[PDB]
Design an enzyme around this catalytic site. Structure first.
Site, PDB file in Angstrom:
ATOM      1  N   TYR A 162      13.286  -8.073   4.116  1.00 55.79           N
ATOM      2  CA  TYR A 162      12.250  -8.238   3.096  1.00 55.79           C
ATOM      3  C   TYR A 162      11.913  -6.949   2.350  1.00 55.79           C
ATOM      4  CZ  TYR A 162       8.845  -6.126   6.284  1.00 55.79           C
ATOM      5  OH  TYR A 162       8.170  -5.258   7.108  1.00 55.79           O
ATOM      6  N   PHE A 195       4.063  -0.136  -0.731  1.00 59.55           N
ATOM      7  CA  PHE A 195       5.352  -0.799  -0.539  1.00 59.55           C
ATOM      8  C   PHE A 195       5.772  -0.813   0.914  1.00 59.55           C
ATOM      9  CE2 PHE A 195       6.066  -0.083  -5.122  1.00 59.55           C
ATOM     10  CZ  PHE A 195       6.596  -1.317  -5.465  1.00 59.55           C
ATOM     11  N   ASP A 196       6.465  -1.876   1.291  1.00 56.70           N
ATOM     12  CA  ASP A 196       6.987  -2.020   2.634  1.00 56.70           C
ATOM     13  C   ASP A 196       8.291  -2.802   2.566  1.00 56.70           C
ATOM     14  OD1 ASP A 196       6.167  -1.542   5.578  1.00 56.70           O
ATOM     15  OD2 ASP A 196       6.656  -3.691   5.587  1.00 56.70           O
ATOM     16  N   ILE A 235       1.881 -13.666   8.645  1.00 58.05           N
ATOM     17  CA  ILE A 235       0.957 -14.283   7.691  1.00 58.05           C
ATOM     18  C   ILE A 235       1.339 -15.728   7.422  1.00 58.05           C
ATOM     19  CG2 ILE A 235      -0.066 -12.342   6.488  1.00 58.05           C
ATOM     20  CD1 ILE A 235       2.343 -12.440   4.539  1.00 58.05           C
ATOM     21  N   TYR A 291      -4.376 -12.388   4.022  1.00 58.10           N
ATOM     22  CA  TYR A 291      -5.392 -11.609   4.741  1.00 58.10           C
ATOM     23  C   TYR A 291      -6.845 -11.893   4.334  1.00 58.10           C
ATOM     24  CZ  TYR A 291      -1.404  -9.016   6.574  1.00 58.10           C
ATOM     25  OH  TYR A 291      -0.221  -8.672   7.181  1.00 58.10           O
ATOM     26  N   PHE A 345       6.549 -10.931  -1.884  1.00 60.15           N
ATOM     27  CA  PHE A 345       7.702 -10.563  -1.056  1.00 60.15           C
ATOM     28  C   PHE A 345       9.039 -11.001  -1.671  1.00 60.15           C
ATOM     29  CE2 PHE A 345       5.447  -9.294   2.823  1.00 60.15           C
ATOM     30  CZ  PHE A 345       4.211  -9.897   2.648  1.00 60.15           C
TER      31      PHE A 345
END
Length: 235
Positions: free
Chosen positions: A37, A47-48, A67, A93, A110
């Site tokens: 992802y 960012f991740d 989530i 969240y 995502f």
């Protein structure tokens, strides 16, 4: 931007397909899935990604390990699919968020690619001897233990051919007399009330080298059982 895939249909999760996948199936509930992802807040200030790891990002679908959006989104993906999912805070969240990482009422987006998904290995040693695919989640969390009395609906298949079909009440630890293979008894002990599941049995956890003469099962045979757990009493 794309298709609303929220179960309630409140535009809570939106999906655009960036690249179409392969094959007909999608992961079902309880399946373990393997993705890569890239994620960001709608604004694009944090960012991740999973891409830095040698191994795919993996989890169990439906168990609430991620989530709500992902539990929803992934159950719509195919092998080799690449998609974009927009996640309203409701399905992520919400009010509080997750400080310091994620600010209040953040929408997340995502890019997700689904590489692989497989049923749950129920064997204590993880040897692929017993694999389960859940058809319908059960209501409960309690499970049978050795000596419990169960009401089951079971259908055995050898090479896609039905050989056994019964609705019985028996005792965990006594299935042998009722011609039930060991792996099945061990599978039931992993199911919840009302669970409909498909269970795959390698010969070792099936009828092994002896076979089962009356069910026209040869020695050393892979078995598919489709079974329903109605109710049970722990002893």
């Amino acid at each position: 931007e794309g298709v609303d895939i929220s179960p309630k249909q409140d535009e809570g999760v939106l999906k655009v397909i960036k690249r179409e996948g392969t094959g007909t199936e999608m992961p079902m509930i309880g399946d373990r899935v393997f993705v890569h992802y890239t994620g960001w807040l709608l604004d694009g200030t944090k960012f991740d990604s999973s891409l830095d790891r040698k191994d795919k990002f993996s989890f169990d679908l439906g168990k609430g390990e991620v989530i709500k959006a992902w539990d929803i989104a992934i159950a719509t993906m195919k092998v080799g699919e690449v998609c974009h999912i927009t996640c309203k805070p409701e399905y992520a969240y919400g009010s509080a968020g997750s400080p310091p990482k994620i600010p209040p009422n953040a929408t997340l987006v995502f890019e997700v690619e689904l590489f692989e998904f497989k049923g749950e290995d129920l064997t204590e040693e993880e040897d692929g001897g017993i694999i389960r695919r859940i058809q319908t989640r059960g209501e409960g969390y309690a499970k049978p233990n050795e000596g419990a009395i169960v009401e089951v609906a079971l259908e055995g298949y050898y090479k896609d051919k039905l050989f056994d079909q019964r609705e019985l009440r028996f005792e965990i630890g006594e299935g042998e007399n009722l011609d039930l293979p060991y792996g099945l008894e061990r599978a039931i002990q992993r199911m919840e009330k009302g669970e409909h599941s498909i269970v795959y049995l390698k010969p070792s956890y099936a009828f092994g080298s002896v076979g089962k003469e009356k069910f026209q099962i040869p020695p050393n045979a892979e078995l598919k059982y489709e079974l329903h757990l109605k109710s049970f009493e722990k002893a």
